[PDB]
Amino acid sequence: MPGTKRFQHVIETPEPGKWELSGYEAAVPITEKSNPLTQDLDKADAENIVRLLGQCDAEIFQEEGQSTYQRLYSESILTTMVQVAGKVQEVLKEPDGGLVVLSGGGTSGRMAFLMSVSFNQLMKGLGQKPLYTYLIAGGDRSVVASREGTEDSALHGIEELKKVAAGKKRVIVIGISVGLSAPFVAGQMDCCMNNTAVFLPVLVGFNPVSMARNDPIEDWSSTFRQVAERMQKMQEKQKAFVLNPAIGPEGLSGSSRMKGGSATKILLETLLLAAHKTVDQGIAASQRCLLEILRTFERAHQVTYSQSPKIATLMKSVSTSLEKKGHVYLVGWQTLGIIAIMDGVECIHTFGADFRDVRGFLIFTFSQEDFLTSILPSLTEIDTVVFIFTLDDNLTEVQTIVEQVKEKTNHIQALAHSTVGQTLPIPLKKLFPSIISITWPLLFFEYEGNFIQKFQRELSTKWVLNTVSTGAHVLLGKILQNHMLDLRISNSKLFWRALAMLQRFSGQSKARCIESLLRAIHFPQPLSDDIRAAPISCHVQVAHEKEQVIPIALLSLLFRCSITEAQAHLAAAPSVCEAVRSALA
Numbered sequence: 001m002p003g004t005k006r007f008q009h010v011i012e013t014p015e016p017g018k019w020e021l022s023g024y025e026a027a028v029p030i031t032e033k034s035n036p037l038t039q040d041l042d043k044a045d046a047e048n049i050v051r052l053l054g055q056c057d058a059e060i061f062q063e064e065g066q067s068t069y070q071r072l073y074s075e076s077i078l079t080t081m082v083q084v085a086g087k088v089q090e091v092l093k094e095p096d097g098g099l100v101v102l103s104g105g106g107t108s109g110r111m112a113f114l115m116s117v118s119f120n121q122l123m124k125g126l127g128q129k130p131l132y133t134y135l136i137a138g139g140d141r142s143v144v145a146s147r148e149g150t151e152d153s154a155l156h157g158i159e160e161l162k163k164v165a166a167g168k169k170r171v172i173v174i175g176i177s178v179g180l181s182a183p184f185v186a187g188q189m190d191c192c193m194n195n196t197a198v199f200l201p202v203l204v205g206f207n208p209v210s211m212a213r214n215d216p217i218e219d220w221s222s223t224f225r226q227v228a229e230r231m232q233k234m235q236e237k238q239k240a241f242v243l244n245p246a247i248g249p250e251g252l253s254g255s256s257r258m259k260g261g262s263a264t265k266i267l268l269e270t271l272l273l274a275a276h277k278t279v280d281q282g283i284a285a286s287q288r289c290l291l292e293i294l295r296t297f298e299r300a301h302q303v304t305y306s307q308s309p310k311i312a313t314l315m316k317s318v319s320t321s322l323e324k325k326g327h328v329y330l331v332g333w334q335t336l337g338i339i340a341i342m343d344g345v346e347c348i349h350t351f352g353a354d355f356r357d358v359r360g361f362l363i364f365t366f367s368q369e370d371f372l373t374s375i376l377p378s379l380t381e382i383d384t385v386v387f388i389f390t391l392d393d394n395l396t397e398v399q400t401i402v403e404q405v406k407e408k409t410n411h412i413q414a415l416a417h418s419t420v421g422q423t424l425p426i427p428l429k430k431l432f433p434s435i436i437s438i439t440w441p442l443l444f445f446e447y448e449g450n451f452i453q454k455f456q457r458e459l460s461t462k463w464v465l466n467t468v469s470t471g472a473h474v475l476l477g478k479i480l481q482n483h484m485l486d487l488r489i490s491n492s493k494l495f496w497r498a499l500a501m502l503q504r505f506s507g508q509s510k511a512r513c514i515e516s517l518l519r520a521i522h523f524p525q526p527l528s529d530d531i532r533a534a535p536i537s538c539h540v541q542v543a544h545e546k547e548q549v550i551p552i553a554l555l556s557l558l559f560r561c562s563i564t565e566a567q568a569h570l571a572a573a574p575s576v577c578e579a580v581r582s583a584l585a
């Protein structure tokens with residue numbers, strides 16, 4: 001019938017009580033699964049939330065059990081890492097016409113960008129000439145914006161890739177998609193396999209290939225699954241690579257910006273650093289070299305979450321300020337500035353949050369006096385301002401700005417990275433009563449800019465920022481069990497996530513859930529055969545512009561009622577959350 005083929009890959013809702021062993025749940029990709037640790041995240045105080053996410057983050061480093069999925073510390077994965085480091089060496093040896101592209105949509109793209117810069121600096125430091133570049137869905141503007149719709153075109157992907165691979169002669173394309181999902185990457189990987197001479201594809205994500213996305217891409221004939229399967233075949237001949245350890249579901253279901261983003265850094269920084277530091281030593285990269293760095297990244301989680309209690313409190317002061325319709329400012333220097341912006345921008349799509357809700361700032365890019373003149377005026381009793389820096393920063397610039405802000409806020413906290421035995425200038429630097437001091441052992445670096453220290457610090461910040469920003473919103477009651485129900489459908493992935501959530505919460509059939517969703521999306525227009533059969537992009541374009549689409553659809557299902565009737569009920573209730581929560585009972 002009309003719609004059949006578009007919705008073919010979707011599995012029927014299991015019967016009440018038979019979800020567990022169901023065919024359905026066995027095909028939910030790991031990255032979209034509901035994490036058992038956070039079943040009750042929506043009922044947790046600030047300290048539990050920190051504990052729970054610290055724990056979910058910790059799953060990145062958990063080792064493989066004995067009939068089960070490969071993980072970061074499994075020998076197949078490290079062997080692949082070694083192998084790829086090997087292929088990066090080849091390019092470094094011959095840099096003329098050599099290039100290394102890191103590419104991804106959304107947060108995978110944001111992480112691509114950071115890493116491209118770091119390794120460019122590193123070659124700058126050696127006076128070698130940068131070999132890295134990055135690609136993000138929707139162009140460079142996307143690095144610091146909410147642009148979730150840009151990832152759905154394989155041709156776009158390929159076009160960006162063809163622009164940058166100029167007339168290069170050896171190109172490594174590292175396509176990063178946490179879910180093995182994004183059509184942007186899919187096309188790139190497939191294009192690379194059609195020209196093995198020039199290109200070498202390396203696919204990075206966190207699902208097994210048997211769980212790689214398999215629904216049709218609107219502008220492309222093959223699915224991610226197929227592309228990934230074909231890459232894995234080519235890996236036997238060392239002409240493609242798939243790097244895909246499981247790291248367990250996200251604490252907030254499907255919020256791949258979190259564990260997904262971190263594992264991407266951990267994994268790629270490790271590998272590329274090993275490649276660099278081992279070429280100049282005249283020595284192959286080895287499991288043992290990779291391990292040193294993995295274990296360092298693993299210490300960094302421990303180091304970071306030692307500050308849990310303070311972290312729980314910064315959460316409360318962020319949540320509070322937002323509960324009162326305040327704003328929250330994230331002020332950081334160098335790369336940690338960037339990471340702050342990236343965190344705040346992500347709150348827009350992840351939480352329906354306005355750009356002012358949680359905004360990042362780098363000394364978006366406003367200098368000392370510039371920030372003092374324009375932004376300083378707008379602060380208020382109830383706002384929260386967060387400062388983020390190392391002791392190797394310009395701390396005269398830092399202290400200055402804290403000074404002005406203090407008079408206007410009082411809710412100011414900070415996040416300070418130091419090697420042990422650097423001290424906080426002003427013993428009255430107690431403009432921060434009890435800081436989040438993060439103090440790093442001394443490590444035997446040998447490169448100029450101390451790149452392992454950089455990565456530790458970024459990562460630790462990302463965890464803190466992520467845990468804080470996500471935590472604040474959970475406390476505000478905007479999350480359901482461990483799902484963001486009320487999201488904005490702005491790409492096809494998010495459309496599938498919506499549909500899945502309707503099945504899960506209603507317990508009703510595929511067909512009913514599909515019907516309720518499309519009615520919610522296209523109301524006031526009823527379901528035509530055209531509409532039922534439309535490409536998913538057509539539904540996205542309409543949904544992207546509306547509010548409460550998913551809850552309206554869930555209410556229509558639970559009350560077995562019309563869209564007209566469900567909107568009226570929603571408007572009859574004190575809040576979306578309360579309308580839904582009570583409808584679930």
Ligand SMILES: C[C@](O)(c1cnc(-c2ccc(S(=O)(=O)c3ccc(N)nc3)s2)c(Cl)c1)C(F)(F)F
Nearest residue numbers: 029032034179181212213493496497500501504
């Ligand atoms: C966990 C849950 O069942 C669920 C959530 N999201 C989903 C999905 C979201 C998006 C998809 S998807 O875009 O088809 C996709 C995305 C990635 C991938 N590798 N394969 C499929 S499935 C599913 Cl299948 C289940 C629940 F409960 F959240 F609804």
Ligand SMILES: O=P(O)(O)OC[C@@H](O)[C@@H](O)[C@H](O)[C@@H](O)CO
Nearest residue numbers: 106107177178179182255256257
């Ligand atoms: O890395 P993937 O699976 O291709 O996902 C790419 C993007 O959709 C994703 O990173 C999204 O922007 C984030 O808001 C998810 O938390």
